[PDB]
Amino acid sequence: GVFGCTLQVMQDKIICLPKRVEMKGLKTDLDLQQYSFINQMCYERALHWYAKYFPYLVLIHTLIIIAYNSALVSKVQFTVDCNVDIQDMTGYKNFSCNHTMAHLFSKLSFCYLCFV
Amino acid sequence: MIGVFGCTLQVMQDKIICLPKRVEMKGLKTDLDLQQYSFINQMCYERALHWYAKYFPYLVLIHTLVIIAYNSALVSKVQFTVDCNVDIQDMTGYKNFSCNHTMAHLFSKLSFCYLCFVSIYG
Amino acid sequence: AFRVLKPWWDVFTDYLSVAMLMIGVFGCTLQVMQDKIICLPKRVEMKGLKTDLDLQQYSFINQMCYERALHWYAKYFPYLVLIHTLVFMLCSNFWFKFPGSSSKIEHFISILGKCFDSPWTTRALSEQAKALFEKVKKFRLHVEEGDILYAMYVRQTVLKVIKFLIIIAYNSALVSKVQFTVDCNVDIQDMTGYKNFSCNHTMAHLFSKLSFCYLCFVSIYGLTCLYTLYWLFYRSLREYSFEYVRQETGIDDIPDVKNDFAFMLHMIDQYDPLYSKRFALFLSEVSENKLKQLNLNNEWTPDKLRQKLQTNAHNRLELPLIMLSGLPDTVFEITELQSLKLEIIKNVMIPATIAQLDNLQELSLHQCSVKIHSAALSFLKENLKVLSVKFDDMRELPPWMYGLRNLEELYLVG
Amino acid sequence: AFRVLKPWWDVFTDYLSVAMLMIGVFGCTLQVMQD
């Protein structure tokens, strides 16, 4: 769980965009900041707390597992959606997001389950 | 060790993001540069955020060098999101702002583990 | 060298100074890292309020209103803390960094180390320390003229007190001066197009709180000084008289020491009274006499005295002595000797161990000062038959020889 | 050998020299970093 924690603190950053709207560009005319805000919002809300705590959970347990870890590995995925009411804050409601480390833990989690 | 860790990231990433609150769907372009936004970060960080929250990395450090009565009721004080009606009108064109910071949920979970550590010690 | 010289209040002050340095270095580190003012032009449903200024003018305004508006004390506070901490360190360590007194301090620490390390201290309270008694006496005659070390320490404490007073005085007023926000009217209009500005910097409130705790620390430091002030201005430490060792080992000597020695004895007592008790003996005159007797008994031994023996003029097994400073015990272990010869041997005490020399009938005395104890004197009164005595200035002549009732022949010269 | 050769003024000058050296190195650090 130590290795996942290092990636969680440093590398685990989520990127987000608003979903609801020759192919032209799709200028969303929002600057960097509320983009970071939306990153935080859909990081806290949509991202599953087990996944957020997964680097911590392995660290805590290393220092019943099969019953609930089996379902929560399939619970997490690469992409994510979230309908959080940032309307009147940025004017958008439904967002798509993805965080960089999603598939890596999915490969890492499956091998970790075999050990236990 | 917990006290230094909290102070370490507080120097690094204790940053609160802020937006002016009150205003198919489109963008909400605000036409404010990063300068005003850092200014608003400072202002609402000072005003809205609770004092114990800001000094949480320092309260832990001082107590280690030298709890349950007040910190138990102070855990519910820290919130993920937060709001501020700061009189920054005629300064940036807004009055109300919604803000929050990465450390909000981090400290709440960090406080939960620390409150256990003090309990076993006492 | 650096340990037995520190009273508890001194160690507390030293660790307070360490905390001072830590506070200061943390403050200066934060100032160098993240001390940034942020500024905006002041006097301008609600919409945006774009100011059409690129980043560079923003930095320039930051610098300008940081220098002008933000108070100089708010900026310099960590650096002030560093300078005051360093001056405190210097004024604390100057007591030992001045070589003139440092040499005396070094010799003092060394002699007490050798003294409480000496087993003969315990032996006298219940060999080579004899050679250390002269070091003790030379140092004690050396530093009775001083007391300037005490005055220098007092002046150091006074300087600490005065600087404390000034620091607390001005900081009490200047804590309120710092503020989170600030307004500046800088005549930068028509060069950047604005004159009124609102600014605030990250450090401000933090420093306030930091300042507060810092002040508290300084305050307790001052209390330490206050303690020493009582310790300086009520005990009258210019004179030291044991009156305890004199009562516990029954030694009427070691009456007093001068102001410098009084003070250093006091400091040792504050550190460890047991070390003062251990060091007390190397000054006793009677203990010095006992150590002289001990070394004398050790180095003159019974085989040596048996070899020295012979027959005198009056056909008696005699142990002639020509150079001595006392009476060896092994001399009294050879009971078969019948006579004794002494030349230039002063400070002589005859113990009742001469009564061990039961077959004693002649004695030869030549220019020696001899005092007998009452039991030994009675033994000689009931045992002497012949005597030889020589006196130059009537001093070596003993009066007690006028008490021996059984003397037959007395030989005198001079 | 290395101590008894330093009168009081010599030691005080040495301390002043050390203080000046740290002042100078601090100034150079500030110039390279923030100036």
Task: Name the residue type at position C8.
Answer: W
C148 burial level (CB within 10 Å; 0-12, 13-18, 19+): middle
Assess contact for C383 and C362: CB atoms under 8 A.
Answer: no
State the Cα–Cα distance between residues C41 and C219, nearest whole angstrom. 42
Instruction: Give the contacts of A36 (CB within 8 A, at least 6 positions apart).
Output: B17
Q: Cα separations (Å) of C164 from A75, C88, C159, C176, C215? A: 64, 10, 8, 19, 10
User: How far apart are the CA of C203 and the nearest CA of chain B, in angstroms?
Assistant: 11
Residue among A15, A13, A21 at smallest CA distance from A35? A15
Structure tokens at A112: 């970790």
Q: At what angle do helices C259-271 and C148-174 cross, to 10 degrees?
A: 60
Residue B17 in contact with partner chain A when CB distance is under 8 A? yes
Cα angle, residue B54 at apex, residues B67 and A10 outer, rounded to 5°: 110
Assess contact for C278 and C115: CB atoms under 8 A.
Answer: yes
B1 burial level (CB within 10 Å; 0-12, 13-18, 19+): exposed
Q: Chain D residues with CB inside 8 Å of C97's CB? A: 11
How long is chain D? Answer: 35
Strand partners, B99: B18, B82
Cα angle, residue C369 at apex, residues C368 and C370 outer, rounded to 5°: 110
Chains that touch B (3 or more CB pairs under 8 A): A, C
Q: Cα separations (Å) of C181 from A91, B34, C73, C205? A: 32, 19, 15, 9
Assess contact for A96 and A42: CB atoms under 8 A.
Answer: no
User: How far apart are the CA of B2 and the nearest CA of chain C, in angstroms?
Assistant: 18
β-pairing, B81-85 vs C37-41, is: unpaired
Q: At what angle do helices C129-143 and C99-116 cross, to 10 degrees?
A: 150
Place of tokens 């009564």: C355
Long-range contacts of A78-84 (CB under 8 A, 24+ apart): A78/A102, A78/A103, A78/A106, A80/A14, A80/A42, A80/A46, A80/A47, A81/A19, A81/A46, A82/A41, A82/A42, A82/A45, A82/A46, A84/A41, A84/A42, A84/A45, A84/A46
State the Cα–Cα distance between residues A34 and A84, nearest whole angstrom. 14
Q: At what angle do helices C129-143 and C259-271 cross, to 10 degrees?
A: 120
Selected residue of D6, D8, D18, D22 to mutate for chain C interface (largest C Cβ count, 10 A): D8
β-pairing, C196-201 vs C310-311, is: unpaired
Q: Which residue of A has its CA nearest to B20?
A: A89
Question: What distance, in Å, lies between the first and last C-alpha atoms of chain D?
Answer: 44
Residue among C31, B14, B122 at smallest CA distance from D33? C31
Over its C-alpha atoms, chain D yields an Rg (Å, rounded) of: 14
Chain centroid to Cα B71, Å, comes to 16
Residue C48 in contact with partner chain B when CB distance is under 8 A? yes
Instruction: Give the contacts of C42 (CB within 8 A, at least 6 positions apart).
Output: B91, C183, C194, C196, C197, C198
- Experimental technique of record: cryo-EM
Structure tokens at C351: 């113990």
State the Cα–Cα distance between residues D2 and D14, nearest whole angstrom. 13
User: How far apart are the CA of C80 and the nearest CA of chain D, in angstroms?
Assistant: 14
Residue C16 in contact with partner chain B when CB distance is under 8 A? no
The phi-psi region of residue C344 (left if phi > 0; otherwise alpha if psi is between -120 and 50; otherwise beta) is left
Q: At what angle do helices C72-97 and C148-174 cross, to 10 degrees?
A: 170
Alpha helices (runs of H) in chain A, residue ranges in sequence order? 2-10, 32-45, 49-62, 65-75, 102-115
How long is chain B? Answer: 122
- Cβ–Cβ gap C34/B11 under 8 Å: yes
Q: Cα separations (Å) of A44 from A2, C189, C202, C217? A: 22, 45, 27, 42
State the Cα–Cα distance between residues D23 and D28, nearest whole angstrom. 9
Question: What distance, in Å, lies between the first and last C-alpha atoms of chain B?
Answer: 18
Q: What resolution in angstroms does the PDB record give?
A: 4.4
Assess contact for A81 and A46: CB atoms under 8 A.
Answer: yes
Residue D25 in contact with partner chain C when CB distance is under 8 A? no
Residue B36 in contact with partner chain A when CB distance is under 8 A? no
Over its C-alpha atoms, chain A yields an Rg (Å, rounded) of: 17
State the Cα–Cα distance between residues C212 and C209, nearest whole angstrom. 5
Task: Name the residue type at position C209.
Answer: K
User: How far apart are the CA of D34 and the nearest CA of chain C, in angstroms?
Assistant: 8
Place of tokens 């911590």: A56
Task: Name the residue type at position C412.
Answer: L
Q: Chain A residues with CB inside 8 Å of B28's CB? A: 30, 34, 88-92
DSSP secondary structure code for residue B26 in this structure: -
SS (H, E, C) chain C: CCCCCCCHHHHHHHHHHHHHHHHHHHHHHHHHHHCCEEEEECCCCCCCCCCCCCHHHHHHHHHHHHHHCCCHHHHHHHHHHHHHHHHHHHHHHHHHHCHHHHHHHHHHHHHHHHHHCCHHHHHHHCCCHHHHHHHHHHHHHHHCCCCHHHHHHHHHHHHHHHHHHHHHHHHHHHCCCCCCEEEEECCCCCCCCCCEEEEEECHHHHHHHHHHHHHHHHHHHHHHHHHHHHHHHCCCCCCECCCCHHHHCCCCCCCCECHHHHHHHHHHHHHCHHHHHHHHHHHCHHHHHHHHHHHHHHHCCHHHHHHHCEECCCCCEEEEECCCCCCCCHHHHCCCCCEEEEECCCCEEECHHHHHCCCCCCCEEECCCEEECHHHHHHHHHHCCEEEEECCCCCCCCCHHHCCCCCCEEEEEC
Strand partners, B101: B16
Residue B11 in contact with partner chain A when CB distance is under 8 A? no
Q: Is A97 helix (H, G, I), strand (E, B) or coil?
A: strand
Residue among C154, C194, C180 at smallest CA distance from C51? C194
Structure tokens at C33: 């890292």
CB atoms within 10 A of CB C356: 16
- Cβ–Cβ gap C99/D4 under 8 Å: yes
| Signed CA dihedral, C379, C381, C383, C389: sign only | positive
Q: Which residue of C has its CA nearest to B8?
A: C30
**Does chain D reach chain C with at least 3 CB pairs under 8 Å?**
yes
DSSP secondary structure code for residue A91 in this structure: S
CB atoms within 10 A of CB A5: 15
CB atoms within 10 A of CB A111: 8
β-pairing, B96-101 vs B81-85, is: antiparallel
For B30, the closest of C40, C48, C205 (CB atoms) is C48
Chain centroid to Cα B44, Å, comes to 9
Strand partners, B97: B20, B84
Structure tokens at C157: 């404490």
Strand partners, B18: B99
State the Cα–Cα distance between residues B82 and B17, nearest whole angstrom. 10
Q: Cα separations (Å) of A106 from A77, A103, A110, C161? A: 8, 5, 6, 66
- Cβ–Cβ gap B27/A29 under 8 Å: yes
H or E element: which one contains B99?
Answer: strand B96-101
Q: Chain B residues with CB inside 8 Å of A32's CB? A: 34
Q: Cα separations (Å) of C373 from B31, C172, C353, C390? A: 113, 75, 10, 21
State the Cα–Cα distance between residues C189 and C197, nearest whole angstrom. 11
